[PDB]
Amino acid sequence: MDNTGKLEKQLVTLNDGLPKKPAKEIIEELKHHLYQDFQKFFSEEKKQQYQNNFALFDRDNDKYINLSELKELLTSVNITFPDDELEELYNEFCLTSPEAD
Amino acid sequence: MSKKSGKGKGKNDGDELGAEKEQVLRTKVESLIQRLGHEQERADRAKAAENELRARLFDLDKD
Amino acid sequence: MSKKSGKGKGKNDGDELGAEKEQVLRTKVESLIQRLGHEQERADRAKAAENELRARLFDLDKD
Amino acid sequence: DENIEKIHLWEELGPVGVRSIMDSLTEIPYLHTKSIRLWKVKAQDEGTRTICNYMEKSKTIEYLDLMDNQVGSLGCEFLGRVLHPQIEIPLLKLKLDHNEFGTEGLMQLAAGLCMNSVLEKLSLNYCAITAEGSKYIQQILSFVNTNLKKLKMKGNLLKNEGVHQLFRAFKVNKTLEKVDLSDNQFDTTLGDDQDPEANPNFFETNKDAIEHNKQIIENICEVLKAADTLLYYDFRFNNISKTDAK
């Protein structure tokens, strides 16, 4: 009685249901859902043209395209990107391919 | 009509549970016998396949 | 100790027979399960041996 | 008064029994179970479909081990449907070793599971994963956003090109730790034609095999050197030549 106590600020500790799974899968739904999202963005007609352009600008046809060929395809399909952003994203996805050129 | 004439006579509960357990055991025994026969056939086919692949080595040998 | 003073008390013959049948069924189930495990192990081992035979060989082929 | 968090059954359930159990699970909104391990219960296609349905309904199971459950390509398609990122079920571990769904089942899975983010570890030993199964393995591994640990294809049929594609994926892989390709027919040996008197033109004939073995060994070396996280490798039961092993 006497209305004594008490207010405690709720500091949410970071210990509630983290993804239980380490190093190959659980970060992948982000890009899979991105894959499902672009499916509404694009019609199937332009996908073949862009695949052809990728093949044209990927001289060694190894699924990997250097920065020069990447920018060549950018200009070919009207990918207007600053050099900084282009190289940033290219190296971002290259670090995912440390053993691939 | 026999609506309210549901006289559940005092059947031997021990006897009924024993009969149910025996039926379950017999069903499990027959299922295990069928599974053992299936696995024996699988093992025989696998042994024959292993021997006949050693023979396929011997098949190229014969060729 | 040595004599035969085994007075024949009138125990439940039906219950004794039921218990004996249940024990026999349990023993048979155990034996069948063990045999099924052996057969499954044999089938898996034969499958693995067949896989290895199809996999490696090739010495006869090169010879 | 306890909840069945890990339904582990090792008796023959058959497709009908698996469907009945899994559909009773579906009809009872029971979200407490965190594992289902059917060891040769014969889940099969109908059981797999029911399991996918109730997993989609509940979204609580985390440790599924359908070993020797006779999961096929249709079951794999249903699994892709259920595990699609649109479903987001928490199943941590997936085991199907000796479940001969095949690489076609792998495709059926990847139809919606190509880029999913669930599993703790995927085991498919003796699942008949072929070279194009290793292609799907490359699809999975070449992804950087990663919260899985162990992908095992032991006892499969990856072979030289299977390992080649797997190491192509490893080249980009930065987070995978353990991989077991043992008993996959990884044959880096050139054969037994090393006696100079035996074959005058052995090298002339087997230069292609020598080159392929050298390429595979170079890829293996690169992946091992650059694998900060990939630190567990099982190349057992494979015909790896002595020079390649050294």
UniProtKB/Swiss-Prot annotation, chains B, C:
It is found in: Cytoplasm, Cytoskeleton, Flagellum axoneme. The keyword Coiled coil applies. Keywords: Cell projection, Cilium, Coiled coil, Cytoplasm, Cytoskeleton, Flagellum. One of its GO terms (cellular component) is motile cilium. Residues 1-23 are annotated as: Disordered. Residues 10-23 have a biased composition (Basic and acidic residues). Disulfide bonds: none annotated. Component of the nexin-dynein regulatory complex (N-DRC), a key regulator of ciliary/flagellar motility which maintains the alignment and integrity of the distal axoneme and regulates microtubule sliding in motile axonemes. Belongs to the DRC12 family. Component of the nexin-dynein regulatory complex (N-DRC). This is Dynein regulatory complex protein 12. The gene is DRC12.
